[PDB]
Design a protein around this ligand. Structure first.
Ligand SMILES: [Zn+2]
Ligand SMILES: [Zn+2]
Ligand SMILES: [Zn+2]
Lengths: 846, 49, 50, 50
DNA sequence: CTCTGAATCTCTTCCGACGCGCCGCGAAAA
RNA sequence: UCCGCGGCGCG
DNA sequence: TTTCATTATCGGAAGAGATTCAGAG
């Protein structure tokens, strides 16, 4: 009669509808419709299990809920499911798609007959027709695995976070895999700061053949030992001895070489490639990949399988045979093996139709065209004939010294043709055809000085590579790990490189000390493997959840105790010699979620003797020189002072335009501090950058009695914005107007009226706690028209009710950056709108 | 109308009706040709046809 | 012998070949190739044996 | 009379009459040069060390 | 096992009397 | 009016 | 005073050019 197909994306809905036709209706169920509770809408344990929804002691009883704005979509889905005869759950291949399909089946009801689980790797006529010829049942095991993961992460977050608030600082968060990623970054930071760049020199030689060709070589042995002078004088002596000596080509080596393409990309490989070639990080890469998949041009972008369908292989082999021809075929397909634990049922990330060139993607933004070009190029490259190089190696001897050249010359190019290198390498040159035992004539020689490379910093893609190596997280997780480590304030990313905040070090050390089992890489990997076993149906979800929860609760109940008992150590203050501008006292070095700062011990004294004066630790932001290449990090390490008490490097902060402060890397475990004088261009407060809408000057982030505000450096302008729960900074501060007469409804608060680029909106006076917002009605504004600032008055003039007598709400037309008024019935738009045009309000069908 | 008019006026198989004598009338109306659209051209008709 | 000589190995490759044959100078494409083939031979839109 | 062309334009005869006189003047095949002259590819004059 | 040359295949081009006679009819350009 | 194209026959 | 993810908003002949099999290295 009329089948219903349910899908998570509206663009997936439009695309699958192109192939399904009139016998089917397709509906988009945008995101997770059902979930565990999120807002406030032995009694401490009772309140904890209510806030969690999950009760670990009462056998995992979960108390799922439907989130605000989902009720309309749930009602539409239910109405369509009542109209339909058979329901087709067409979520993506992975667990999350199974958990969405489960929530859909459970909300809509009638399980035993009225559901089919559709499964397709690409949104195309043949794949869809084959999937609808043979749909499955809902894989409940994978749903259970996803629920187990979610329950673990909520258990750890909600149980740990109050502990960290009590011991260390309010406004911390924690997470199972997140904390282990932070541990990785902090360990690399400690390796970097505790490293010494040594000094080695190298010599380079310039030579001409009897045939007048020219050759350049590098010098690598003295006295049959490795040539590695330690100082300048030694290098100059070596250069002298070299110049005096006479050179001959005692060694002539030659050999063919063959080079092959990489595998078609898995998600981690795609992120690494997009970072290295195009500069896209993780978020942009996965957003554009999701768009390309939803448009239909590429296969699903969450995969760890390198496998390819026979259809794909035949298509690409046809393309190569037609365009390139037989030399680049080659004789048989290039196989690639993924991990034995990989989702080998999945495909790689490949084009859906190899003939669609990136330029043809009319509806994709240019960055997405570039990403598609990368996917296409890799897919074509993987199956072609490997390339062919011939290689020459030369060694030349003079006195106590031997010096070497290596060069390769390229003679078949097949995979390199489609997928060229970014730049020529050091061996991508032509050594002249000197004979065996040839002679050489000599040109003047150059020394070079180089420093030992530290254990160099990880970027987003290299951190994803490290996680993939250890087995922490999975293809679906990686983007969430990389985002959440930043959002939670333990790690910051700058110069496309990862840097670890002092608070991340504190939390890492505390969590390692107290929760050693949770933070150990092996136990994280074993947990991920056990979730994979659950998805296999090798294990029982509730079982492993119970085992985890028992261990975690043991460690928590140990950790809660006093520090003399051995419980989690509280926050700590490292004193130094500095005069508090408010009392002169010695001053100590402190870490907050905002950063690292200088505090006066009177903060710990009761009101009578309390001192709230604080100083910002404006840091010397490391400015890595891109032109120094690999040197750039080494010289940064060289730039740092070294602590007197230990080898660990020191990190640098500005306290006055006259004074600067050095602090040891192992602070507060190490108590070394140094203070230095000089003419310094101090910022007063350092951190993020923001541009003042009222004067265009730089604007900077500052802390005080109300937490964190944002304030503009121009002394003639005091324009200040403010931080808010889930955004970089609030919109232009102009006339925030309070109303006591509008009550909130989910909370006891009262409503306030606010302006910004988003529009004009009502928001609740305890905003970080209430977080309740709704658009104003026109009649509301009219009721409080005297309060409205002079400009906003026009909105109160607007027509309060539509021609049907429905009621009207005030909306921002982002495409045209103007307010308009619109009416809704049953919560759907009536399709009526009125706009402001030259002092008048004009109204009609939308 | 344009298609009908063009077929009846300009098509190769709508030639002038010759009216010398009634025998001409009959033999012209009863004539059966292999030329025209979809047929074959004069300059390529071999002896086999 | 014909099966020993045809470069093609599946339905898609043959469709690509026929597209490449009947219209030079334009890129092959799954949907367009399928559409022109079906409307050219197995549809009354363009073909009719009276 | 005469007409000046905003863009220099080649002759059809020497371009297409087999054998292509311009083609034999160069070492280029005739196909790539004709697709060039209808503006579907560039031609390169060297300077430097690519 | 690979590379080059030679030979065939595939495509493109050119062209099939000539002299009349007769008939009709041009246009999204003005 | 003198231009061009298509069809038909004659030798 | 809070902490959790993860969304998706005509026939024949000749000439030139291109791909194919056979011989040498
Ligand atoms: Zn003080
Ligand atoms: Zn130290
Ligand atoms: Zn300002």
């Amino acid at each position: 009669g009329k089948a219903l197909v349910i899908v998570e994306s509206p663009a997936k809905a439009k695309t699958i509808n192109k192939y399904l036709g009139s016998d089917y209706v397709v509906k988009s169920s945008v995101g997770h419709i059902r979930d565990l509770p999120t807002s406030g809408s032995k009694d401490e344990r009772g309140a904890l299990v209510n806030r969690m929804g999950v009760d670990p002691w009462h056998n995992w009883e979960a108390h799922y809920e439907v989130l605000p704005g989902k009720e309309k979509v749930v009602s539409e889905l239910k109405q369509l499911a009542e109209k339909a005869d058979h329901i087709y759950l067409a979520t993506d291949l992975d667990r999350e798609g199974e958990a969405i399909a489960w929530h859909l089946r459970e909300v809509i009801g009638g399980d035993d007959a009225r559901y089919s689980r559709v499964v397709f790797n690409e949104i195309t006529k043949n794949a869809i027709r084959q999937a609808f010829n043979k749909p499955g049942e809902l894989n409940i095991d994978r749903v259970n695995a996803q629920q187990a993961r979610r329950f673990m992460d909520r258990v750890v977050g909600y149980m740990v976070s109050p502990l960290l608030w009590k011991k260390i600082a309010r406004g911390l968060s924690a997470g199972r895999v997140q904390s282990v990623a932070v541990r990785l970054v902090v360990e690399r930071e400690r390796e970097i700061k505790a490293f010494v760049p040594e000094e080695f020199w190298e010599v380079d030689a310039s030579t001409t053949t009897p045939s007048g060709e020219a050759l350049a070589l590098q010098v690598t042995h003295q006295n049959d030992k490795p040539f590695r002078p330690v100082n300048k004088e030694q290098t100059q002596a070596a250069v002298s001895l070299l110049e005096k000596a006479r050179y001959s080509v005692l060694e002539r080596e030659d050999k063919p070489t063959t080079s092959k393409p990489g595998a078609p990309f898995i998600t981690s490989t795609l992120q690494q490639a997009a970072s290295t070639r195009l500069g896209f990080g993780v978020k942009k890469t996965m957003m554009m990949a999701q768009r390309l998949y939803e448009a239909g041009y590429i296969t699903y972008m969450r995969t760890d399988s390198t496998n390819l369908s026979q259809d794909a292989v035949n298509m690409v082999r046809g393309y190569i045979s037609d365009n390139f021809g037989k030399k680049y075929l080659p004789e048989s397909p290039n196989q690639y093996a993924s991990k034995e634990n990989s989702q080998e049922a999945h495909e790689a990330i490949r084009p859906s139709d190899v003939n669609v060139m990136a330029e043809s993607l009319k509806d994709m933004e240019a960055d997405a065209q570039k990403l598609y070009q990368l996917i296409w190029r890799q897919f074509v490259a993987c199956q072609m004939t490997p390339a062919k190089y011939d290689s020459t190696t030369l060694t030349v001897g003079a006195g106590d010294f031997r010096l070497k050249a290596r060069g390769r010359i390229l003679r078949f190019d097949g995979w390199t043709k489609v997928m060229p290198a970014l730049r020529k390498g050091d061996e991508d040159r032509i050594l002249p055809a000197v004979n065996k035992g040839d002679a050489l004539t000599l040109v003047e020689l150059t020394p070079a000085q180089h420093f030992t490379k530290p254990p160099a910093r990880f970027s987003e893609a290299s951190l994803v590579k490290e996680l993939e190596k250890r087995g922490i997280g999975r293809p679906s997780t990686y983007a969430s790990i990389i985002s959440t480590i930043q959002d939670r304030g333990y790690v910051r990313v700058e110069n496309r490189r990862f840097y670890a905040e002092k608070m991340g070090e504190i939390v890492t050390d505390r969590l390692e000390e107290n929760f050693r089992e949770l933070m150990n890489y092996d136990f994280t990997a074993q947990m991920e493997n056990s979730l994979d076993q659950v998805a296999n149906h090798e294990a029982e979800w509730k079982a492993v959840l119970d085992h985890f929860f028992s261990d975690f609760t043991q460690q928590l109940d140990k950790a809660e105790k006093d520090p003399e008992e051995g419980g989690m150590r509280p926050n700590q203050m490292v004193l130094t010699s500095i005069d508090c501008p408010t009392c002169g006292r010695k001053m100590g070095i402190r870490t907050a979620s905002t950063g690292v700062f200088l505090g006066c011990s009177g903060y710990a004294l009761p009101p009578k003797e309390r001192c709230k004066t604080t100083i910002n630790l404006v840091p010397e932001n490391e400015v890595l020189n891109v032109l120094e290449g690999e040197d750039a990090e080494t010289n940064a390490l060289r730039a740092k002072r070294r602590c007197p008490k230990c080898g660990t490097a020191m990190d640098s902060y500005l306290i006055d335009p006259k004074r600067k402060l050095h602090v040891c890397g192992n602070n507060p475990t190490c108590d070394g501090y140094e203070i230095e004088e000089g003419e310094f261009r101090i910022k007063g407060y350092d951190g993020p950058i923001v541009e003042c809408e009222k004067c265009g000057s730089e604007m900077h982030l500052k802390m005080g009695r109300f937490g964190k505000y944002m304030a503009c450096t121009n002394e003639e302008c005091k324009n200040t914005r403010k931080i808010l729960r889930n955004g970089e900074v609030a919109p232009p501060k102009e006339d925030p107007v309070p109303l006591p007469e509008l009550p909130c409804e989910k909370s006891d608060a009262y409503f306030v009226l606010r302006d910004g680029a988003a529009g004009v909106f009502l928001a609740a006076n305890t905003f970080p706690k209430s977080r309740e917002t709704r658009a104003p009605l026109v009649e509301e504004l009219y009721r409080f028209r005297d309060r409205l600032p002079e400009k906003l008055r026009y909105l109160a003039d607007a027509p309060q009710q539509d021609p049907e007598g429905n009621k009207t709400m005030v909306r921002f037309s982002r495409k045209t950056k103007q307010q308009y008024v619109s009416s809704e019935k049953d919560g759907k738009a009536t399709g009526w709108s009125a706009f402001y045009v030259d002092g008048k309000w004009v109204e009609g069908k939308k | 109308s344009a298609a009908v008019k063009e077929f009846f006026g300009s098509s190769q198989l709508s030639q002038f009706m010759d009216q010398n004598n009634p025998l001409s009338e009959i033999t012209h109306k009863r004539r059966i040709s292999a030329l025209g659209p979809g047929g074959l051209t004069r300059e390529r008709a071999g002896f086999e046809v | 012998e014909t099966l020993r000589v045809d470069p093609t190995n599946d339905r898609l490759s043959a469709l690509v070949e026929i597209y490449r044959m009947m219209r030079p100078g334009e890129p092959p494409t799954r949907e367009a190739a399928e559409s022109l083939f079906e409307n050219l031979f197995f549809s009354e839109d363009r073909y009719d044996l009276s | 009379g005469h007409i000046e062309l905003a863009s220099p334009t080649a002759h059809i005869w020497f371009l297409k009459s087999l054998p292509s006189r311009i083609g034999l003047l160069l070492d280029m095949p005739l196909r790539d040069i004709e697709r060039v002259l209808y503006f579907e590819s560039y031609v390169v004059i060297e300077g430097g060390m690519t």
